[PDB]
Ligand binder design. Structure first.
Ligand SMILES: *[C@@H]1O[C@H](CO)[C@@H](O[C@@H]2O[C@H](CO)[C@@H](O)[C@H](O)[C@H]2NC(C)=O)[C@H](O)[C@H]1NC(C)=O
Ligand SMILES: C[C@]12N[C@H](Cc3ccccc31)c1ccccc12
Ligand SMILES: N[C@@H](CCC(=O)O)C(=O)O
Lengths: 378, 339, 279, 239, 101
């Protein structure tokens, strides 16, 4: 059976670097070491039994492995992590253009004040000395309609000055709408669609039972983390045990099918999974900080130290450009995550609801004005 | 194939054969064809100064979708777009409430106008306060339209690209699979690159298992979609890329080479030929010919056009008009009915 | 908006009016015992393109409503028209002016009323080649010849010269390694007189074939790509460059403005024609 | 409470004053406190002589060791442990013992903040103002043209309002065309006005483009690494 | 960290020469075995995250405030100034026009 990968390539580097011939085989009992009762299992067993001198792989580092054996390299950055296919949505329609609000909203109120002066010029023209006096109120309602995308039957103002003043306002309204849509145009960018989950501290993970919706997080059996989970939340570990999967593709498919809500694993591998997704529907948590910090470690007989000697060769290797070549060779991942952007055919119904809440508030306000008339003062 | 030096059956040692071996053999004294120029061949025979400098690219690409039903859909799917329209109608009830303690058809029509800027005539309710909602509902209606337009532009964002073009440095190409049914022409010079490049051994075989006797079949496989990707030198490929545009070339030409006539060694003319083709470059002849044939072919770039797709909803509208006026005879019956 | 403007939209708009016109006359006449004119045409016009139309509204129930629906859909199309033009605004090939040199504009500066300018370094293979094939270009460009590539660059960069001509590798590296990305390779930088660097030997007696072998060994090893990235690397990678919010020196809309003027003239002489109909 | 420890300090910014008592705290100090409590050991902290992390210097007079800055101090035995953001590397590992990494980091480049962009009024000058001046003038001529024939067989103000109705899109509707020929004229001109505003919606579209490509500098791909530009100075920390 | 505290400074995107931090001791230190085990425990426990999060999290830089209005809107102020100025001249001029006819 042939073997591939950057570790394999490192081993090639090591054939030359430490000048040592090697025999390579595959483990049978337990994969990455598993400790049950009196005797440990996995490659670590073959390291303890003297069958294996050094154990190599994606193996994570832990204190217990440390009492028993050692690794002086820490070549890669890996941590527990979750891949969630989620999205980011607009909030408050760019706060109804809140930026305009600091200066723009007040000026709109100020704009109404300009209108009163215009009406004052206009009233004299209208009556040197039926009931057009309703026009000023109508004009404000009327002026306001012309402000937003027309669509006001309103009333026809006659006073000569109003037409010019209206034109000055109309011009403004038009360019307002231009800026409005530019604000809207800018938002298209703001329709950032990045995955929306938190880190390890998130309540969806910490207190899963409370949420009405059914979701579950899980990890692979006999992993180093199981213990971390049991040393973080025992209950969470039990939940993970209930929904256990075994192969990467099990999790993958489950995630693609939605059988699995999200998935935690060594981030390094998960990053690689993003490095190899078909369709790009999976991402890391937030930035991708795993929240568990560790690097791959290689086993050595506790008595054995070629690692101290081995260490020297390894660093320069860190310094050398090839690690990055190996990265580019094997770790290159498709669909680099440029702040992701996307367009929705479902638009936004909750943002729409936000809009509708403002709308509803206005409805309440009109009910209040009804009440004022309902209880109009004598 | 032009041919490559290969194991001769049991003997295992043999001449490149094909076009070249015939040349060594003397069947053809001189070889005129599109032949890339390489050292492995070069020791055996003299080559003229390269005529062209073509580089290998991967000639493939498939259709890129543009939803016909996507733009309006932003409303359709949201479903608060229709419902709120009805609530615009409901605002009429609130207005009646405003009327109390200070026509339905006109109201509904008025509500329809704000979505559509109807400007019918009567205007706002007598109560000034009631009329405030008109400003609000039209406000939001306006906002919605504009917002839609912005989301219409969100569709325009497009910018969803396969982005699998960089094969030499591309992650997908390097780690081949059944999703990477990849080939070349059986016995093609790139095979030497895969051969010599032990780094590409994986790919060498991955490639080999899918190879073709010729370009017509190799281009066809991608066109037939039998094979997802095709690898060949650009000069043959780009012209085809222009020819269909259903297929595309991607990445950066690798392993550049000059084109030079292949002839048996010691040809007392190759030098003159080299001078002659040199002149062809000098006088612009070579250049004139390359434009003359390649120039004829051209395809569109990444420029967006509407293409009369989304217009059908309006076709639907016109169909609805017909339904409308049919209903209209019953609407006028109503006036007649109140006869 | 050109595809939509081309066929289906206008005919459909006429039909809606016409359906309304038939219904409006019959229905309106139905509504009032005691008409579709130009006003109806304006209505196709009012509903269809962002309002701003003050002439009229039909007095009937079925058609008017149908058109409000039309208008709403039409607005979507209008919005899309804006988006379509936005698509144009999304990116633009700010490379339009190209001197192919097979065009003959370069062949003569004098054909173009303002004086054009291009020059190259003298005592070059380029200059000798030029003199061999194209005399007029040489005899004209002698005035625009420059001392050194840094100085030739001074003539291009600070103004006082439009175009510069030189070796393609140097010009490509220069494009990459440049303070300003405004300078860009001509077209695709696809060069005429396609050539490469040449290594001298004495005569027929020399290293010959063994030496060439080494060269194509380099291509196989792949060292040249690395050396290219290191020594030949270029700034501002040549993606399709784009420009935004550019001075709006319309040219096609200018044409449209002319269309307007012409259409007016037609209608004016149409009125004259009509007037004559009488006499 | 922010845990702090008294750390002997070296030379201050002012002349001399090499000997001082100072206050130390932060990520590494909290780590030291944890380690000391965990392994149960007492300590005294001081800031490294000559202010450096540590690099060997080959030939200043006789051949010299990796005694530079903080690292050498340790070699002397003055410092029994280094607790700082000390990078683990091959060169140093050959002489001292590093614990498993408490932090994974990579080199990057720090540069000044990027420049900003202009306001909309300023934006208007590039396209909106010239067109507005030219076109506004054009509307009056168009209004005059229809009347010509009408005159032959505040009207001007009304015509302007009708033509302006399109621009602002106010659609005041103060006045209507006098004759059928004018309507054809209106049919002509009204359509043109609609096109003009739709082109203004193209101008509306043009506002969004102000997106800026800006720039970023590659570690190896970029020209600056390629040459330390004389005009463009870059550097790192000594030793 | 600096870029997160001083918004006038920014980092180049590329990360190169990946490397990492550690406690330093002489090779024969009797605390070496203990020092790492402790580091590992702190990483797994979350102690390391508390320190990094506690100290690092204090400061962040964002693109908050979008683009609409703000600085772009300042010239709009000029526009607003332009509406008010025009009406006053028309008053007397309009009155004169009325007097004329
Ligand atoms: C190319 O360079 C050569 C050598 O520099 C030039 O030859 C000189 O031309 C100058 C003209 O002022 C004479 O004064 C010298 O006697 C020539 N010989 C030298 C200086 O070596 C030549 O002119 C250049 N090509 C041009 C512009 O014709
Ligand atoms: C005129 C206008 N009325 C709506 C929305 C809007 C928003 C901002 C500016 C202008 C417009 C519209 C749709 C399409 C083109 C132009 C517009
Ligand atoms: N990464 C370790 C353990 C998994 C875990 O951390 O849960 C392994 O490969 O087995």
């Amino acid at each position: 059976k042939c073997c591939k990968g950057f570790c394999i390539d490192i081993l090639k580097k090591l054939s030359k670097t430490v000048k040592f011939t090697y025999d390579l085989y595959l483990v049978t009992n337990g994969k990455h070491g598993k400790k049950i009762k009196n005797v440990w299992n996995g490659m670590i067993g073959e390291v303890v039994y003297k069958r294996a001198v050094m154990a190599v792989g994606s193996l994570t580092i832990n204190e217990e492995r440390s009492v028993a054996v050692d690794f002086s390299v820490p070549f890669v950055e890996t941590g527990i992590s979750v891949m969630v296919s989620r999205s980011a949505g607009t909030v408050s329609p760019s706060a109804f253009l809140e930026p305009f609000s600091a200066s723009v909203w007040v000026m709109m109120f100020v704009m109404l004040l300009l209108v009163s002066a215009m009406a004052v010029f206009i009233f004299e023209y209208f009556s040197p000395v039926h009931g057009p006096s309703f026009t000023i109120g109508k004009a404000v309602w009327l002026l306001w309609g012309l402000v937003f995308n027309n669509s006001l039957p309103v009333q026809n103002p006659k006073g000569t000055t109003s037409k010019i003043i209206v034109s000055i306002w109309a011009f403004f309204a038009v360019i307002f709408l231009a800026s409005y849509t530019a604000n809207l145009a800018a938002f298209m960018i703001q329709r950032r669609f990045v995955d929306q989950v938190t880190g390890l501290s998130d309540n969806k993970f910490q207190r899963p039972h409370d949420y009405s919706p059914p979701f579950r997080f899980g990890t692979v059996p006999q992993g180093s983390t199981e213990r971390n989970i049991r040393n973080n939340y025992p209950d969470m570990h039990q939940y993970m045990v209930k929904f256990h999967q075994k192969g990467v593709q099990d999790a993958l498919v489950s995630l693609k099918t939605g059988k699995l809500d999200a998935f935690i694993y060594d981030a390094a591998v998960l990053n690689y999974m993003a490095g190899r997704d078909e369709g790009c529907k999976l991402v890391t948590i937030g930035s991708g900080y795993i929240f568990a910090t560790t690097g791959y470690g290689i086993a050595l007989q506790k008595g054995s130290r070629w690692k101290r000697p081995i260490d020297l060769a390894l660093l320069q290797f860190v310094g050398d450009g090839e690690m990055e070549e190996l990265e580019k060779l094997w770790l290159t991942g498709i669909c680099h995550t440029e702040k992701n952007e996307v367009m929705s055919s479902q638009l936004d119904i909750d943002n729409m609801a936000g809009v509708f809440y403002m709308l509803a508030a206005a409805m309440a306000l009109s009910l209040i004005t009804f009440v004022w008339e309902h209880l109009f003062y004598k | 194939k032009f041919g490559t030096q290969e194991r001769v059956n049991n003997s295992n040692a043999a001449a490149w054969n094909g076009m070249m071996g015939e040349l060594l053999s003397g069947q053809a004294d001189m070889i005129v064809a599109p032949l890339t120029i390489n050292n492995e061949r070069a020791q055996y025979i003299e080559f003229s100064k390269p005529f062209k400098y073509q580089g290998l690219t991967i000639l493939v690409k498939k259709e890129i979708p543009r939803s016909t039903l996507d733009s309006f859909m932003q409303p359709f799917q949201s479903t608060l777009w229709l419902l709120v329209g009805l609530s615009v109608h409901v605002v009429a009830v609130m207005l009646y409430l405003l009327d109390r303690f200070s026509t339905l058809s006109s109201a509904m029509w008025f509500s329809w106008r704000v979505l559509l800027n109807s400007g019918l005539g009567e205007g706002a309710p007598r109560s000034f306060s009631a009329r405030i909602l008109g400003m609000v509902w039209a406000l939001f209606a306006m906002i919605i339209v504009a917002s839609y337009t912005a989301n219409l532009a969100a569709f325009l964002v497009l910018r969803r690209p396969e982005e699998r073009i960089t094969g030499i440095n591309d992650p997908r190409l390097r780690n081949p699979s059944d999703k990477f049914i990849y080939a070349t022409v059986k016995q093609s010079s790139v095979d030497i690159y895969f051969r010599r490049q032990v780094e590409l051994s994986t790919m060498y075989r991955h490639m080999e298992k899918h190879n073709y006797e010729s370009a017509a079949e190799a281009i066809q496989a991608v066109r037939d979609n039998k094979l997802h990707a095709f690898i060949w030198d650009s000069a043959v490929l780009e012209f085809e890329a222009s020819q269909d545009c259903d297929l595309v070339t991607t990445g950066e030409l690798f392993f550049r080479s000059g084109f030079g006539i292949g002839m048996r060694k010691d040809s007392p003319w190759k030098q003159e030929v080299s001078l002659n083709i040199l002149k062809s470059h000098e006088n612009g002849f070579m250049e004139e010919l390359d434009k003359t044939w390649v120039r004829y072919q051209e395809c569109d770039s990444r420029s967006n056009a509407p293409a009369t797709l989304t217009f059908e909803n309006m076709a639907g509208v016109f169909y609805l008009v017909a339904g409308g006026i049919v209903a209209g005879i019953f609407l006028i019956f109503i006036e007649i009915a109140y006869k | 908006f050109l595809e939509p403007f081309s066929a289906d939209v206008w005919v459909m708009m006429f039909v809606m009016l016409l359906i309304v016109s038939a219904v409006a006359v019959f229905v309106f006449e139905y509504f009032s015992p005691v008409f579709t004119i130009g006003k109806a045409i304006w209505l196709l016009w009012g509903l269809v393109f962002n309002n701003s139309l003050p002439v009229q509204n039909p007095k009937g129930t079925t058609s008017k409503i149908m058109v409000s629906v039309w208008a709403f859909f039409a607005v979507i199309f209008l919005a899309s028209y804006t988006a379509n033009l936005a698509a144009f605004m999304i990116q633009r090939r700010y490379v339009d002016q190209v001197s192919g040199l097979s065009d003959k504009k370069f062949q003569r500066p004098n054909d173009f009323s303002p004086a054009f300018r291009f020059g190259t370094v003298p005592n070059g293979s380029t200059e000798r080649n030029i003199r061999n094939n194209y005399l007029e270009m040489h005899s004209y460009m002698v005035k625009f010849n420059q001392r050194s590539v840094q100085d030739a660059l001074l003539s291009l960069k600070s103004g006082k010269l439009d175009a510069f001509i030189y070796d393609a590798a140097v010009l490509n590296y220069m494009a990459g390694r440049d303070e300003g990305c405004k300078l860009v390779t001509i077209g695709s930088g696809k060069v005429f007189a396609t050539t490469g660097y040449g290594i001298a030997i004495q005569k027929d007696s020399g290293w010959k074939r063994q030496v060439d072998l080494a060269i194509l060994q380099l291509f196989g090893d792949g060292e040249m790509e690395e050396l290219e990235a290191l020594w030949l690397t270029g700034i501002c990678h040549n993606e399709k460059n784009e420009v935004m919010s550019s001075q709006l020196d319309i040219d096609n809309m200018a044409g449209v403005f002319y269309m307007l003027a012409a259409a007016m003239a037609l209608s004016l002489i149409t009125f004259i024609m009509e007037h004559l109909f009488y006499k | 409470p922010i845990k702090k420890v008294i750390c002997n300090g070296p030379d201050e910014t002012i002349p001399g004053r090499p000997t001082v008592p100072q206050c130390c705290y932060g990520f590494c100090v909290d780590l030291l406190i944890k380690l000391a409590r965990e392994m149960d050991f007492t300590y005294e902290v001081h800031l490294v002589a000559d202010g450096k992390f540590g690099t060997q210097e080959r030939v200043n007079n006789s051949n010299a060791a990796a005694w530079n800055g903080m690292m050498g101090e340790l070699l002397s035995g003055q410092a029994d442990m280094i607790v700082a953001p000390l990078t683990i590397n091959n060169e140093r590992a050959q002489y001292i013992e590093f614990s498993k990494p408490f932090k994974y980091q990579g080199l990057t480049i720090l540069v000044k903040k990027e420049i900003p962009r202009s306001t909309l009024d300023s934006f208007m000058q590039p396209f909106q103002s010239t067109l507005w001046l030219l076109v506004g003038l054009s509307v009056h001529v168009v209004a005059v043209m229809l009347y010509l024939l009408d005159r032959f067989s505040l009207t001007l103000s009304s015509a302007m309002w009708f033509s302006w109705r399109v621009l602002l899109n106010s659609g005041l509707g103060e006045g209507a065309p006098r004759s059928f020929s004018a309507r054809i004229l209106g049919m002509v001109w009204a359509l043109f006005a609609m096109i003009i505003v739709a082109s203004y919606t193209a101008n509306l579209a043009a506002f969004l483009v102000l997106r800026r490509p800006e720039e970023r500098i590659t570690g190896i791909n970029d020209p600056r690494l390629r040459n330390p530009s004389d005009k463009f100075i870059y550097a790192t920390v000594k030793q």
